[PDB]
């Protein structure tokens, strides 16, 4: 049947509207709640509806976060409404997000099964947009804490990427502790493994470097089997951290003695044909020292993305490249002057 609810626009005036949807169906389940997919009856558009059980007393981290966000590389919150909870002090929040069935994961797994590697052009396009979204959400102090191929939505025709699933996201406040066992194993930063609770949103950059590395290699770079095996996988490439590095990751972790293993060459981590600049970029993302990782903006401005800033550039299918330089003040806040490097003089309006 055709469901109709009174919802509030995600980005926009707090005044409700009716909203009817149909062809609803569960596509995901878990601890977080339930996710459905449906079609809008007046927009035709397909959307995803995440239904979470919320405690009335408190606000909903995810809802609050999605409301500040209005960026082109971030899944848009169309509407949101509530549902009758069962236990008097509980409600079901219904985030009506945008639906895209394609993910950088599916795509990547596609090429992987076809034994070949993803085209460099796409690796630059995807990673680029990923960083902008990171730069944007970080500018608010928001950390996604769950960056991975599966949470990266794609438009197969436009080549546009959107960050999604802010279920683990959180507005970070220095001095206030954050859970250390957060983020999907394969993408979890070293400091999280070492028990850090005073970490920063730079754990998202470590994760991005992992996604990048994964696109270059054809499979995740650090496929640890547990928390301890994760560090072992990391050590296999970066070797063991120096005391200075350990202090940086976790000021409160102490190990009086441990065997020191050196790092392997990045040039050998990847296949021989891997573009050098992708490796270079990757080495500045997968660092033990959190503060040493490139910031999203610095990364967007990296030499690896130079080709995206070229006027002639086009997609392998003659199509145009999505909006890559429509940076806002918010988005540039961390280092406004970099704006002159990110924005090609051939894009200035």
């Amino acid at each position: 049947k055709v469901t109709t609810v009174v919802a509030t626009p995600g980005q926009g005036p707090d005044r409700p509207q009716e909203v009817s949807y149909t062809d609803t169906k569960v596509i995901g389940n878990g601890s977080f709640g339930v996710v459905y997919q449906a079609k809008l009856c007046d927009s035709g558009e397909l959307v995803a509806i995440k239904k979470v059980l919320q405690d009335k007393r408190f606000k909903n981290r995810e809802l609050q976060i999605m409301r500040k966000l209005d960026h082109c590389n971030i899944v848009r919150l169309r509407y949101f409404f509530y549902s009758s909870g069962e236990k008097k002090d509980e409600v079901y929040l219904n985030l009506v997000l945008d639906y895209v069935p394609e993910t950088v994961y599916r795509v990547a797994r596609h090429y992987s099964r076809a034994k070949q590697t993803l085209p460099v052009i796409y690796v630059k396009l995807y990673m680029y947009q990923l960083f902008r979204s990171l730069a944007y959400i970080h500018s608010f102090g928001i950390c996604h804490r769950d960056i991975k191929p599966q949470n990266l939505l794609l438009d197969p025709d436009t080549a546009v990427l959107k960050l999604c699933d802010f279920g683990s996201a959180k507005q970070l406040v220095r001095g206030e502790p954050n859970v250390s066992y957060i983020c999907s194993r394969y993408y979890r930063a070293p400091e999280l493994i070492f028990g850090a609770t005073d970490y920063t949103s730079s754990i998202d950059v470590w994760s991005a470097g992992c996604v990048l590395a994964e696109l270059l290699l054809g499979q995740p770079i650090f496929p640890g089997d547990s928390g301890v095996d994760q560090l072992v996988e990391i050590i296999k490439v970066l070797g063991t951290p120096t005391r200075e590095q350990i202090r940086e990751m976790n000021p409160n972790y102490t190990e009086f003695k441990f065997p020191q293993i050196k790092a392997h060459p990045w040039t050998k981590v990847f296949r021989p044909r891997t573009p050098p600049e992708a490796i270079a970029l990757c080495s500045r993302l997968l660092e033990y020292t959190p503060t040493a990782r490139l910031t999203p903006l610095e990364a967007c401005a990296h030499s690896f993305f130079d080709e995206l800033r070229d006027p002639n550039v086009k997609l392998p299918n003659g199509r145009d490249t999505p909006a890559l330089f429509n940076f806002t003040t918010q988005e540039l806040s961390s280092n406004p002057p970099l704006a002159t490097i990110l924005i090609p003089p051939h894009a200035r309006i």
């Binding site: 066992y181 493994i193 070492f194 028990g195 547990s226 928390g227 301890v228 095996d229 560090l231 072992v232 050590i235 296999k236 063991t240 951290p241 350990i246 972790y253 102490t254 190990e255 009086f256 003695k257 441990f258 065997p259 293993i261």
Partner: peptide, 25 residues
């Protein structure tokens, strides 16, 4: 149970040392 195992390696201060051991087996 690895969470606990990790929690102990971290509490005890034998995370790096232990990971290296496993690295050699």
């Amino acid at each position: 149970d690895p969470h606990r195992l990790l929690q102990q390696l971290v509490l005890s201060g034998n995370l790096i040392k232990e990971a290296v051991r496993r690295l050699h087996s």
